[PDB]
TrEMBL record, chain A:
<protein>
    <recommendedName>
        <fullName>Envelopment polyprotein</fullName>
    </recommendedName>
</protein>
<comment type="similarity">
    <text>Belongs to the phlebovirus envelope glycoprotein family.</text>
</comment>
UniProtKB/TrEMBL annotation, chain B:
<feature type="domain" description="Phlebovirus glycoprotein G2 fusion">
    <location>
        <begin position="4"/>
        <end position="325"/>
    </location>
</feature>
<protein>
    <recommendedName>
        <fullName>Envelopment polyprotein</fullName>
    </recommendedName>
</protein>
<comment type="similarity">
    <text>Belongs to the phlebovirus envelope glycoprotein family.</text>
</comment>
UniProtKB/TrEMBL annotation, chain C:
<comment type="similarity">
    <text>Belongs to the phlebovirus envelope glycoprotein family.</text>
</comment>
<protein>
    <recommendedName>
        <fullName>Envelopment polyprotein</fullName>
    </recommendedName>
</protein>
Length: 301, 431, 54
């Protein structure tokens, strides 16, 4: 159970159209390279969600996995005039972000990955509204919200945001408040299904069903100091693979292991498996559960 | 057959509506009071939109009258058997000393049994004095020591959570039916408060209340029935009473964790040179659990377990006299203005008059789609609301009367147009 | 020495299923250690009061 927070299952891509200037050190994501769209997620005591779900995908990797659609335009230009579609959705996200950045991705209303862009030479400010002039400039994207991603094909397009006591949150127009309302800033989690809308969460109820999954094992190497290798190259029971790998009872109980004859050591991961959600009193399997800090307009007499 | 009985109308102080896309969306925000029903009878708050056919229903069905118990101080007890490990060692060899084996500390691990480890299993270290010379097994004339490393092990394959009661809470299990159609089941006890999607419910008026449960302790068994003990609850883990070796969780009892509490100096010992017979004298909880297994009647009631939820309850033989308090947290209630029509037919009438049980009615509603039927008399005494469905379906609800010779013409309307309907039937005197 | 209480001890000669004979003893609510598991006396309604003054 060695903590390896660099191995990315699936595609492992972190780039958006219109600003593909990070496809050299982040396509795919491995131990080699420097990408600001992944190195900021490995901070100590800052992002506990990504540290808990280390062996899971994110948002950009979910978009590049051909399992969810992207916003149009995917990269709104903050430099052009006559407004832009990416203004009313990001202006309400009153959060902090460091400087020397050029992009910031988030979730819109249609459940799509909406991001911005900054052509050379412009950098984001403290809020991220406009771009100003400029030391190295991080050409990646700073995640404004903490979330994860996983593989799921469960239906749920007719399920929208179900909140109680809140008339308007973020930018979506939920229930109609005939009386008054109080403007406040609170942290409200959200969720997303397979081709649905941005369903906010009021009672965060998550669980992890750890099962024998291919993305829950990390293979090492044999020299004669145990570095990572790959998990998709280990042979299976009745199948075929490259170099032979072995391990404990978990790796040998599902795959093939020869111990001495094997050339790799496959060990069990930590904090990975089937993750479901509890919304509308029923258990569902979403794509990614996250949270954000936006404007919350609750009810008031 | 049993349906809504206490049918009241919502006041206009907290009732509002707004037309959005030719759809009257009624909204409620306030506190309303409704009369609770008896066993079988139901209660619902009928909503009034902006016209006749726009009328919903919030029917709530009462399961039965339960008397739940209030928990508080509890602990996890169980049976345990010690495993003594003796190892006699001569003097001047290792740690066998005449002045060290006598004043031997419990937290210190002896060298003769340090290979076991410093795990979380309940253990203790003793030290007895034996003999010396060639008469037992030594070389010096000084007496030898006896290193003892006794550890506890779990005997019973299951644990029990012995709790107590301080008051009997009269809990009423309710099955609230929402306006859209989502059926939810909750419960209200004495002054409990349960939040829902459309607001929150709470019980106000109470009636049954057994007083005198502080001198009785209960036994809970996971997966099986409960029990009852006829003695006051014990808290101090002393010797003799129930709870000599207790813990705080099921894993702390099934695996014997060090977090459990026990009485100091409770394991006996019998030093026999090289032999050892360590034993305890704890009371077996399964003895009282079997001698007092539910059902166990007391005075004039019947104590039993609950169905579904874990917890002790009680059954009584009294009536149901309570008042339910409703609350709406701005719940939007929409209804299409183009309702469907349907015709009703009389079937039978059997029940009682001037009683809490009321009298059930049989009505055959034949329509073309899912709608809502509204019927009202002339003197303004009763009102009938039945959810209309497609095809010929059998409906009806509880209708209370004040005369055994029921004879009153009712006018039912499904979408605005009213139709006459005459009902009849005899009833019996039920108090 | 003295005696604080008279423990009703019952010397039992438990015979296993195969035929192994084991002689043990059980008093009040004491438990022992046998090859087939463990055994302990349950009900006990026999005792002699007034033993501290002897």
């Amino acid at each position: 159970e060695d903590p390896h927070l660099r191995n990315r299952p699936g595609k492992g891509h972190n780039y958006i159209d219109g600003m593909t200037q990070e496809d050299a050190t982040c396509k795919p994501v491995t131990y080699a390279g420097a990408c600001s769209s992944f190195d900021v997620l490995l901070e100590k005591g800052k992002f506990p969600l990504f540290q808990s779900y280390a062996h899971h995908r994110t948002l950009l990797e979910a978009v590049h996995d051909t399992i969810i659609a992207k916003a149009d335009p995917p990269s709104c230009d903050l430099q052009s005039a006559h407004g832009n579609p990416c203004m009313k959705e990001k202006l309400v996200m009153k959060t902090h972000c460091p400087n020397d950045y050029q992009s910031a991705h988030y979730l819109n209303n249609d459940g799509k990955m909406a991001s911005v862009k900054c052509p050379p030479k412009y950098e984001l400010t403290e809020d991220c509204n406009f771009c100003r002039q400029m030391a190295s400039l991080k050409k990646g994207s700073y995640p404004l919200q903490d979330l994860f991603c996983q593989s799921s094909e469960d239906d749920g397009s007719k399920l929208k945001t179900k909140m109680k006591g809140v008339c308007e949150v973020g930018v979506q127009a939920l229930k109609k408040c005939d009386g008054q309302l109080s403007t406040a800033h609170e942290v409200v989690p959200f969720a997303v299904f397979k081709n649905s809308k941005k369903v906010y969460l009021d009672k965060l109820d998550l669980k992890t069903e750890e099962n024998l999954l291919p993305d829950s094992f990390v293979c090492f190497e044999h020299k004669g100091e145990l570095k990572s290798f790959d998990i998709s190259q280990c042979p299976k029971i009745g199948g075929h693979g490259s170099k032979k790998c072995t391990g404990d009872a978990a790796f040998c109980s599902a795959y093939e292991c020869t111990a001495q004859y094997a050339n790799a050591y496959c060990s069990h991961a930590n904090g990975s498996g089937i993750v479901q959600i509890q919304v509308s009193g029923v258990w569902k399997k979403p794509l990614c559960v996250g949270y954000e800090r936006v404007v919350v307009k609750r009810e008031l007499s | 057959d049993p349906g809504c009985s206490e049918l009241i109308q919502a006041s206009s102080r907290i009732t509002t509506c707004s037309t959005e896309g030719v759809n009257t969306k009624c909204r409620l925000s306030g506190t309303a009071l409704i009369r609770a029903g008896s066993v079988g009878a139901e209660a619902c708050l009928m909503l009034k939109g902006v016209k006749e056919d726009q009328t919903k229903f919030l029917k709530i069905k009462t399961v039965s009258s339960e008397l739940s118990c209030r928990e508080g101080q509890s602990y996890w007890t169980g049976s345990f058997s010690p495993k003594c490990l003796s190892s006699r060692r001569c003097h001047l060899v290792g740690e066998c000393h005449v002045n060290r084996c006598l004043s031997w500390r419990d937290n210190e691990t002896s060298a003769e049994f340090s290979f076991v480890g410093e795990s979380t299993t309940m253990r203790e270290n003793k030290c007895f004095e034996q003999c010396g010379g060639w008469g037992c097994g030594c070389f010096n004339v000084n007496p030898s020591c006896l290193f003892v490393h006794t550890y506890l092990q779990s005997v019973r394959k299951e644990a029990l959570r012995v709790f107590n009661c301080i008051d009997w809470v009269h809990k009423l299990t309710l099955e609230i039916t929402d306006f859209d159609g989502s059926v939810s089941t909750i419960d209200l006890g004495a002054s409990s408060s349960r939040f829902t999607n459309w607001g929150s419910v709470s019980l106000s008026l109470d009636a049954e209340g057994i007083s005198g449960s502080n001198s009785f302790s209960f036994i809970e068994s996971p997966g099986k029935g409960y029990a009852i003990v006829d003695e006051p609850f014990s808290e101090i883990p002393r010797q003799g009473f129930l709870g000599e070796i207790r813990c705080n969780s099921e894993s702390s009892v099934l695996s014997a964790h060090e977090s459990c509490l026990r009485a100091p100096n409770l394991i006996s010992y019998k030093p026999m040179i090289d032999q050892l017979e360590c034993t305890t004298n704890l009371i077996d909880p399964f003895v009282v659990f079997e001698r007092g297994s539910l059902p166990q009647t007391r005075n004039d009631k019947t104590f039993a377990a609950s169905k579904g939820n874990r917890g002790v309850q009680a059954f009584s033989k009294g009536s149901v006299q309570a008042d339910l308090t409703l609350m709406f947290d701005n719940f939007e209630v929409d209804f299409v203005g183009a309702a469907v029509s349907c015709d009703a037919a009389f079937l039978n009438l059997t029940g009682c008059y001037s009683c809490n049980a009321g009298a059930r009615v049989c009505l055959s509603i034949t329509s073309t789609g899912t709608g809502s039927l509204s019927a009202h008399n002339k003197d303004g005494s009763l009102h009938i609301v039945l959810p209309s469905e497609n095809g010929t379906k059998d409906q009806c609800q509880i209708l209370h009367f004040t005369v055994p010779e029921v004879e009153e013409e009712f006018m039912y309307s499904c979408d605005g147009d009213e139709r006459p309907l005459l009902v009849k039937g005899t009833l019996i005197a039920i108090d």
